[PDB]
Design a protein around this ligand. Structure first.
Ligand SMILES: CC(=O)N1CCN(C(N)=O)CC1
Length: 185
């Protein structure tokens, strides 16, 4: 792909994080802690899942960023509306304000409703995410496989400002402790 020149510097918003997440000093990495991280509760925190938002809000233009997923067994990545539900149980779908892909149990899927099987021959260590606000597009790229396309959501109805979206996943297995990292430009 040729989207690299739309690169944006994403940082994580601590206030939105599930209370078990540990965000690095530079706000560029996040991982699952083994306990509650001793923060107060607030209406922005994702309560049920190990999720956090980027601080940046996008309402126009073209944006690109990359995320390192090395080692991980489970994660979700993409964008979401600023007004997505934070509390209780919900599915990741465009109807609920999410445009995401994930890894779960050795398969990759796009967060459509119902979910869509992805076809990835080279398991990615870094994912590129491209948003074209005006066109209504969210695309995912396999940086490990020379930038090959993973998935395109088109005809998106964003219906609000967008925020970068992250889920580090649970670590029931002891094999999913590794962080998500925002990769340098
Ligand atoms: C600081 C710490 O607990 N860890 C465990 C998770 N890590 C990993 N899997 O890469 C980083 C080191």
């Amino acid at each position: 792909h040729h989207h690299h020149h739309h690169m944006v510097h994403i940082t994580l918003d601590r206030n939105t994080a599930n209370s078990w997440l540990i965000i690095s000093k530079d706000r560029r990495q996040v991982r699952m802690g083994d306990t509650h991280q001793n923060v107060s509760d607030n209406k922005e925190r994702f309560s049920n899942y190990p999720m956090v938002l980027g601080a940046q809000r996008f309402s126009s233009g073209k944006m690109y960023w990359e995320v390192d997923v090395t080692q991980k067994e489970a994660w979700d990545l993409g964008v979401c509306r600023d007004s997505v539900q934070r509390k209780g149980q919900f599915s990741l779908s465009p109807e609920n304000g999410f445009w995401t892909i994930w890894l779960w149990q050795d398969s990759y899927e796009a967060g459509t409703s119902p979910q869509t099987t992805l076809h990835i021959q080279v398991p990615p260590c870094q994912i590129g995410i491209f948003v074209d606000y005006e066109a209504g597009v969210v695309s995912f790229y396999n940086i490990t496989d020379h930038g090959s396309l993973i998935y395109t959501f088109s005809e998106c109805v964003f219906a609000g400002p967008l925020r970068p979206f992250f889920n580090v996943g649970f670590n029931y297995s002891g094999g999913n402790a590794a962080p998500l990292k925002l990769c340098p430009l």
